[PDB]
Design a protein around this motif. Sequence first.
Motif, PDB file in Angstrom:
ATOM      1  N   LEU C  66      14.780  33.281  47.808  1.00 46.93           N
ATOM      2  CA  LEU C  66      13.722  33.942  48.962  1.00 46.93           C
ATOM      3  C   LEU C  66      12.398  33.481  48.421  1.00 46.93           C
ATOM      4  O   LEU C  66      11.646  33.089  49.127  1.00 46.93           O
ATOM      5  CB  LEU C  66      13.922  35.652  48.646  1.00 46.93           C
ATOM      6  CG  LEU C  66      15.256  36.091  49.636  1.00 46.93           C
ATOM      7  CD1 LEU C  66      15.390  37.568  49.864  1.00 46.93           C
ATOM      8  CD2 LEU C  66      15.004  35.534  51.034  1.00 46.93           C
ATOM      9  N   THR C  67      12.023  33.459  47.025  1.00 45.29           N
ATOM     10  CA  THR C  67      10.983  33.158  46.525  1.00 45.29           C
ATOM     11  C   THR C  67      10.425  31.635  46.844  1.00 45.29           C
ATOM     12  O   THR C  67       9.483  31.393  47.124  1.00 45.29           O
ATOM     13  CB  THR C  67      11.035  33.338  45.013  1.00 45.29           C
ATOM     14  OG1 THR C  67      11.275  34.580  44.563  1.00 45.29           O
ATOM     15  CG2 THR C  67       9.816  32.753  44.140  1.00 45.29           C
ATOM     16  N   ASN C  68      11.447  30.936  46.960  1.00 46.72           N
ATOM     17  CA  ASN C  68      11.228  29.440  47.467  1.00 46.72           C
ATOM     18  C   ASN C  68      10.935  29.356  48.809  1.00 46.72           C
ATOM     19  O   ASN C  68      10.263  28.440  49.217  1.00 46.72           O
ATOM     20  CB  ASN C  68      12.527  28.874  47.189  1.00 46.72           C
ATOM     21  CG  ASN C  68      12.575  27.403  47.384  1.00 46.72           C
ATOM     22  OD1 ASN C  68      11.456  26.878  46.931  1.00 46.72           O
ATOM     23  ND2 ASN C  68      13.410  26.766  48.399  1.00 46.72           N
ATOM     24  N   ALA C  69      11.523  30.225  49.551  1.00 45.75           N
ATOM     25  CA  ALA C  69      11.327  30.264  51.166  1.00 45.75           C
ATOM     26  C   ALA C  69       9.912  30.575  51.080  1.00 45.75           C
ATOM     27  O   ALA C  69       9.156  30.139  51.981  1.00 45.75           O
ATOM     28  CB  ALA C  69      12.438  31.067  51.998  1.00 45.75           C
ATOM     29  N   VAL C  70       9.561  31.471  50.450  1.00 46.73           N
ATOM     30  CA  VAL C  70       8.212  32.018  50.422  1.00 46.73           C
ATOM     31  C   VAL C  70       7.070  31.126  50.136  1.00 46.73           C
ATOM     32  O   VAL C  70       6.075  30.924  50.805  1.00 46.73           O
ATOM     33  CB  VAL C  70       7.919  33.551  49.466  1.00 46.73           C
ATOM     34  CG1 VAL C  70       6.584  33.823  49.878  1.00 46.73           C
ATOM     35  CG2 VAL C  70       8.577  34.632  49.437  1.00 46.73           C
ATOM     36  N   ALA C  71       7.248  30.556  49.153  1.00 49.19           N
ATOM     37  CA  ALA C  71       6.553  29.297  48.717  1.00 49.19           C
ATOM     38  C   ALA C  71       6.501  27.973  49.601  1.00 49.19           C
ATOM     39  O   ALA C  71       5.531  27.200  49.487  1.00 49.19           O
ATOM     40  CB  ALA C  71       6.819  28.823  47.355  1.00 49.19           C
ATOM     41  N   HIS C  72       7.013  27.725  50.450  1.00 46.43           N
ATOM     42  CA  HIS C  72       7.434  26.695  51.339  1.00 46.43           C
ATOM     43  C   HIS C  72       7.462  27.629  52.877  1.00 46.43           C
ATOM     44  O   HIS C  72       8.245  26.906  53.522  1.00 46.43           O
ATOM     45  CB  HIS C  72       8.775  26.207  51.450  1.00 46.43           C
ATOM     46  CG  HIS C  72       8.725  25.423  50.112  1.00 46.43           C
ATOM     47  ND1 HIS C  72       7.841  24.414  49.917  1.00 46.43           N
ATOM     48  CD2 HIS C  72       9.183  25.759  48.757  1.00 46.43           C
ATOM     49  CE1 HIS C  72       7.783  24.155  48.567  1.00 46.43           C
ATOM     50  NE2 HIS C  72       8.611  24.906  47.808  1.00 46.43           N
ATOM     51  N   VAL C  73       6.827  28.674  52.909  1.00 42.78           N
ATOM     52  CA  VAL C  73       6.930  29.390  54.091  1.00 42.78           C
ATOM     53  C   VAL C  73       6.538  28.744  55.335  1.00 42.78           C
ATOM     54  O   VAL C  73       6.810  29.043  56.454  1.00 42.78           O
ATOM     55  CB  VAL C  73       6.063  30.599  53.818  1.00 42.78           C
ATOM     56  CG1 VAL C  73       4.346  30.291  53.765  1.00 42.78           C
ATOM     57  CG2 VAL C  73       6.217  31.670  55.057  1.00 42.78           C
ATOM     58  N   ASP C  74       5.675  27.628  55.106  1.00 46.37           N
ATOM     59  CA  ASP C  74       5.485  26.538  56.105  1.00 46.37           C
ATOM     60  C   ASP C  74       6.577  25.488  56.454  1.00 46.37           C
ATOM     61  O   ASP C  74       6.522  24.403  57.338  1.00 46.37           O
ATOM     62  CB  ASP C  74       4.090  25.797  56.111  1.00 46.37           C
ATOM     63  CG  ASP C  74       3.169  26.971  56.280  1.00 46.37           C
ATOM     64  OD1 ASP C  74       3.221  27.414  57.317  1.00 46.37           O
ATOM     65  OD2 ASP C  74       2.154  27.054  55.286  1.00 46.37           O
ATOM     66  N   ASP C  75       7.676  25.394  55.690  1.00 45.14           N
ATOM     67  CA  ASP C  75       8.633  24.381  55.945  1.00 45.14           C
ATOM     68  C   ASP C  75       9.931  24.877  55.807  1.00 45.14           C
ATOM     69  O   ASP C  75      10.430  24.760  54.912  1.00 45.14           O
ATOM     70  CB  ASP C  75       8.199  23.128  55.093  1.00 45.14           C
ATOM     71  CG  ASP C  75       9.051  22.069  55.282  1.00 45.14           C
ATOM     72  OD1 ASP C  75       9.354  21.802  56.406  1.00 45.14           O
ATOM     73  OD2 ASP C  75       9.164  21.283  54.457  1.00 45.14           O
ATOM     74  N   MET C  76      10.174  26.182  56.220  1.00 43.70           N
ATOM     75  CA  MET C  76      11.268  26.924  55.692  1.00 43.70           C
ATOM     76  C   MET C  76      12.753  26.091  55.838  1.00 43.70           C
ATOM     77  O   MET C  76      13.537  26.142  54.865  1.00 43.70           O
ATOM     78  CB  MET C  76      11.542  28.322  55.842  1.00 43.70           C
ATOM     79  CG  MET C  76      10.496  28.891  55.652  1.00 43.70           C
ATOM     80  SD  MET C  76      10.860  30.788  55.545  1.00 43.70           S
ATOM     81  CE  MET C  76       9.959  31.395  57.167  1.00 43.70           C
ATOM     82  N   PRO C  77      12.950  25.404  56.946  1.00 42.22           N
ATOM     83  CA  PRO C  77      14.230  24.591  57.599  1.00 42.22           C
ATOM     84  C   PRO C  77      14.418  23.657  56.322  1.00 42.22           C
ATOM     85  O   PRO C  77      15.747  23.796  56.270  1.00 42.22           O
ATOM     86  CB  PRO C  77      13.461  24.004  59.022  1.00 42.22           C
ATOM     87  CG  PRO C  77      12.979  25.361  59.274  1.00 42.22           C
ATOM     88  CD  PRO C  77      11.650  25.384  57.920  1.00 42.22           C
ATOM     89  N   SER C  81      17.644  23.733  53.871  1.00 39.89           N
ATOM     90  CA  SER C  81      18.648  23.253  54.542  1.00 39.89           C
ATOM     91  C   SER C  81      19.983  23.199  53.583  1.00 39.89           C
ATOM     92  O   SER C  81      21.129  23.411  54.175  1.00 39.89           O
ATOM     93  CB  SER C  81      18.179  21.574  54.614  1.00 39.89           C
ATOM     94  OG  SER C  81      17.841  21.020  53.121  1.00 39.89           O
ATOM     95  N   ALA C  82      19.825  22.901  52.217  1.00 38.66           N
ATOM     96  CA  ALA C  82      20.833  22.729  51.274  1.00 38.66           C
ATOM     97  C   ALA C  82      21.635  24.247  51.271  1.00 38.66           C
ATOM     98  O   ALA C  82      22.681  23.849  51.257  1.00 38.66           O
ATOM     99  CB  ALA C  82      20.091  22.740  50.024  1.00 38.66           C
ATOM    100  N   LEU C  83      20.767  25.448  51.358  1.00 37.85           N
ATOM    101  CA  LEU C  83      21.439  26.591  51.565  1.00 37.85           C
ATOM    102  C   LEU C  83      22.192  26.759  52.758  1.00 37.85           C
ATOM    103  O   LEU C  83      23.147  27.439  52.785  1.00 37.85           O
ATOM    104  CB  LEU C  83      20.545  27.573  51.066  1.00 37.85           C
ATOM    105  CG  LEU C  83      20.697  28.731  49.916  1.00 37.85           C
ATOM    106  CD1 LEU C  83      21.418  28.332  49.026  1.00 37.85           C
ATOM    107  CD2 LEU C  83      19.043  28.816  49.665  1.00 37.85           C
ATOM    108  N   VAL C 135      17.863  30.432  59.455  1.00 42.86           N
ATOM    109  CA  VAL C 135      17.665  29.056  59.016  1.00 42.86           C
ATOM    110  C   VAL C 135      19.085  28.987  58.528  1.00 42.86           C
ATOM    111  O   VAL C 135      19.590  27.936  58.859  1.00 42.86           O
ATOM    112  CB  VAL C 135      16.674  28.880  58.116  1.00 42.86           C
ATOM    113  CG1 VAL C 135      16.823  27.592  56.952  1.00 42.86           C
ATOM    114  CG2 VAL C 135      15.180  28.689  58.759  1.00 42.86           C
ATOM    115  N   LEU C 136      19.556  29.934  57.797  1.00 43.33           N
ATOM    116  CA  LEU C 136      20.875  29.738  57.033  1.00 43.33           C
ATOM    117  C   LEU C 136      22.064  29.758  57.937  1.00 43.33           C
ATOM    118  O   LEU C 136      22.959  29.359  57.384  1.00 43.33           O
ATOM    119  CB  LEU C 136      21.102  30.884  55.959  1.00 43.33           C
ATOM    120  CG  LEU C 136      20.081  30.926  54.921  1.00 43.33           C
ATOM    121  CD1 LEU C 136      20.427  32.471  53.825  1.00 43.33           C
ATOM    122  CD2 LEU C 136      20.275  29.831  54.196  1.00 43.33           C
TER     123      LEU C 136
END
Lengths: 146, 146, 141, 141
Positions: C66-77, C81-83, C135-136
């Motif tokens: 979640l923390t990573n998605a937040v930090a990349h909020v502009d490219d969540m896809p 992807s990996a997840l 996304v998931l």
Amino acid sequence: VHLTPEEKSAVTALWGKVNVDEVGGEALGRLLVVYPWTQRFFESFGDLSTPDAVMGNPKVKAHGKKVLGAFSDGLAHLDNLKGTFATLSELHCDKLHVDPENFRLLGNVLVCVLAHHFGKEFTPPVQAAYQKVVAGVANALAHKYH
Amino acid sequence: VHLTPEEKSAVTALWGKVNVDEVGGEALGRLLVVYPWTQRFFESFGDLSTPDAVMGNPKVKAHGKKVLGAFSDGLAHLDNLKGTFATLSELHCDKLHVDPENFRLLGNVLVCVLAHHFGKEFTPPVQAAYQKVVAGVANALAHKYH
Amino acid sequence: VLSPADKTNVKAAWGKVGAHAGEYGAEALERMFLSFPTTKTYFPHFDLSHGSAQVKGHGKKVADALTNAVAHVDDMPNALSALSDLHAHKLRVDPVNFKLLSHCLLVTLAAHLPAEFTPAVHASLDKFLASVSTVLTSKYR
Amino acid sequence: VLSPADKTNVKAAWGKVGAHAGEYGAEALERMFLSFPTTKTYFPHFDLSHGSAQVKGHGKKVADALTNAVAHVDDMPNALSALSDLHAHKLRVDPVNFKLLSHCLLVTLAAHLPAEFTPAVHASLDKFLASVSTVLTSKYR
Ligand code: HEM
Ligand code: HEM
Ligand code: HEM
Ligand code: HEM
Ligand SMILES: O=C(O)[C@@H](COP(=O)(O)O)OP(=O)(O)O
């Protein structure tokens, strides 16, 4: 299951013309094909990498008549699809760990295979008693989950 | 619904501490904010263009208190929610034309307001009983739709 | 779609989580196990008791994504992807369960961020979670 | 996400509806109303009786948008812009309903195109109906 006798007499009369073999086999394979993630519980069945590898597999097939096989019997206790299904309820939960949602998914594929098959005969109104049936089934299969 | 007695005690002791006037205003208003389409029914309540126009709207605040006072009275009838809510079920169906799914939206939004207010006191097991209560209401409310 | 204020709202509520994410991911998960027991069907090999460390370890995992998605909020896809690969092809988690866990997450934050859990901020986080679940499950079929 | 087998398959089935797409749009509505009565709360102004004119005309409207999605399979978002807007801001149908009417469009199709409604055509239409549903509700919030 709130069924009118109209509704039940409708259900019962269509079912009577069901070839369980072919309809249970076609129903479980469309599931494996339409909603590919339900496949996670059958890798032991074989190759399911194609609609045809799927459609054609004897295992999916025989698991379809088996499943449709037990559907047939609850139609015999539409008045208690909760105690008709209790054991199958705890096995789905407790041993096989199947998410009950898959149950909803099957009911919906079922209703499309009946339509497919009975064309003109599976009417708005016949479809609707059936929708009450596969939703009381999903619910009774789903009620000993814990 | 089927609540333990340790579940109906928890529901009930907490509920005890809620300020219904202000928790109905806060759960109805957070609904119109997070699920904006839900405003379809409240055109006559005025300005709901912003979060503060909604949450501070005195009509929102006064409808929310009607809703939860009603919600509050079925809490005394956990063993008879269908009977408890049947004229409001027909009201919402027959006259207001409210899609029942609205009802499941508000129980969840209610569950987040309780968490919001009780903090640590809304524990995992207190939430799971409220989750039950709210689904009971949602359903009891949706019973008589046709 | 996340607007500039959804982002700001999520950059900010998530920012207070700060160091409890893990703790909180672990709590979201028990909330979920208890309220929506059908969810336990995916964690049969886990210990699902209060404080299981399997749970504490899975929660932090979740909270880090979640923390990573937040930090990349502009490219969540791309960030996730990996997840999505994983969830689409190996866990094969019915979509419906993302919505139940996103709700136990909203409840957990609501419960720990009294102050920040505004209507506006509730809204943002709801859209947020919803787009991480989207996304998931994007590669499911 | 439609793959090229998907779009090919939808182009095909859809081609066979041809001329009955309206007939079918209307009975898809008629199966829904009856199987999912809750869907009726959105048409309180329509006569919902069998063979109503309202329903029939509505059947065609909808059929034509489907048609128009088949044709612009690669640009739905733009083909359907006006319509998402209509649904997100005016109608506001709760998103869950999109799936009940998609399902009735499936049944209806199945019942009228037995030779072509094969497992992969079925799977394709399904993903189709799901992405037009996602496009209708994409601006809800
Ligand atoms: C729709 C209602 C369903 C009914 C009435 C049903 C009925 C059955 C029955 C009668 C069995 C045989 C159990 C035994 O050996 O005693 C079975 C096994 C099983 N079912 Fe269900 N089934 C249903 C749906 C599902 C669905 C949708 C799935 C998952 C996609 C599923 C997954 C399984 C699995 C994995 C087994 C174990 C098969 C084996 O022994 O390998 N079932 N089911
Ligand atoms: C969830 C539990 C609910 C309860 C206990 C409840 C209770 C009530 C009550 C007591 C009334 C007034 C009845 C009357 O005027 O006779 C009412 C009216 C109304 N309800 Fe509900 N309600 C609930 C949920 C909802 C939801 C989720 C919506 C839709 C978003 C909704 C929409 C309405 C509307 C639009 C009115 C009429 C307002 C007006 O113009 O006066 N209610 N409700
Ligand atoms: C917003 C949603 C979600 C996020 C961010 C998420 C993230 C993750 C992450 C980071 C992992 C660890 C993968 C690794 O080992 O690198 C994982 C695994 C897993 N997740 Fe998810 N997940 C989400 C939703 C769900 C839901 C709803 C379920 C089930 C109801 C689920 C079931 C699983 C399972 C069974 C595993 C396998 C873990 C193990 O066996 O340790 N996930 N997820
Ligand atoms: C496949 C998904 C759908 C499509 C393609 C679709 C398409 C349409 C079209 C083409 C119109 C006509 C607008 C105009 O030009 O006047 C319309 C209106 C409308 N739609 Fe949708 N729709 C869909 C899903 C839904 C659902 C699921 C519902 C409710 C259950 C719904 C409720 C309405 C209503 C109430 C109207 C306006 C009725 C009237 O005033 O005639 N739509 N829709
Ligand atoms: O499944 C139920 O909801 C019922 C019954 O009634 P019907 O509403 O099915 O007519 O038993 P419950 O589950 O509340 O304990």
